[PDB]
Write a structure and sequence with these properties.
- Its EC number is 3.5.2.6.
- Belongs to the class-D beta-lactamase family.
- With 242 residues, the chain is of the alpha+beta class.
- The protein has ten helices and nine strands.
- The strands form two sheets. It has a seven-stranded mixed sheet, sandwiched between helices. Strands 4-5 form a two-stranded antiparallel sheet.
- α3 crosses α5 and α3 packs antiparallel against α9.
Length: 242
């Protein structure tokens, strides 16, 4: 069911990095990773939590639809793209933490906790502050657990409405061309060691879907582009994308 391919480690070491890529072939129900241990080690989800958070906010009516405007609160932050109005699409594109913090406050502890249990999401533990637990609280998720969750979302099998799942998958749209579609979400965890970057999502082909989840050590922000670059080098090696 699971195959370890350490030849992918070259893609990390050539960039003076360490990490894990996990791939799942939906047609064949077979998984592949360079590091079975790290594939099952649990990390803070950081901004990858914007996927479940969006689903919960939509299903409870905290977010009406993907056009609703969340007005900038007028507090200047160090990420320029955060100092503006956003909707669900742009808030996910730019990983706009303060918008999702407000979602979490309106969701509340009780409903957030139950919904994460219904999703079987990671360790399902929201210990910490309700507006930051995915950044510095007790919640943890592994790369293999990200894949399990994403497969449910792809098949509209999560315990929220079909509409909520369709909207979040629209908001995850990252890249599309004549060869593939990528729906994904980046993450960057810095408040708790080890600092890591995430990229989780899937690649849609004409006749198959390949789910992926990667994380990697991220001692400085200088290496953030490697999250997508390393993943795509693996995808290219496996002839999933040209």
């Amino acid at each position: 069911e699971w195959q370890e391919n350490k030849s992918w480690n070259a893609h990390f070491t050539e960039h003076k990095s360490q990490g894990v890529v996990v791939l799942w072939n939906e047609n064949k129900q077979q998984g592949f990773t360079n590091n079975l241990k790290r594939a099952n080690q649990a990390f803070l989800p950081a901004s990858t939590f914007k996927i479940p958070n969006s689903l919960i906010a939509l299903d409870l009516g905290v977010v009406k639809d993907e056009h609703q405007v969340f007005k900038w609160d007028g507090q200047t932050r160090d990420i320029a793209t955060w100092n503006r109005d956003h909707n669900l699409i742009t808030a996910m594109k730019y990983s706009v933490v303060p918008v999702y913090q407000e979602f979490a406050r309106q969701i509340g502890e009780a409903r957030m906790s139950k919904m994460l249990h219904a999703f079987d999401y990671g360790n399902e533990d929201i210990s910490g502050n309700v507006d930051s637990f995915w950044l510095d609280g007790g919640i943890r998720i592994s790369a293999t657990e990200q894949i399990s969750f994403l497969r449910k979302l792809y098949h509209n099998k999560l315990h929220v409405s079909e509409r909520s799942q369709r909207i979040v998958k629209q908001a995850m749209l990252t890249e599309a061309n004549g060869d593939y579609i990528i729906r994904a979400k980046t993450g960057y965890s810095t408040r708790i060691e080890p600092k890591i970057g995430w990229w989780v999502g899937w690649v849609e082909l004409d006749d198959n879907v390949w789910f992926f989840a990667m994380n990697m050590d991220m001692p400085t922000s200088d290496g953030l582009g490697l999250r997508q670059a390393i993943t795509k080098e693996v995808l290219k090696q496996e002839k999933i994308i040209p």
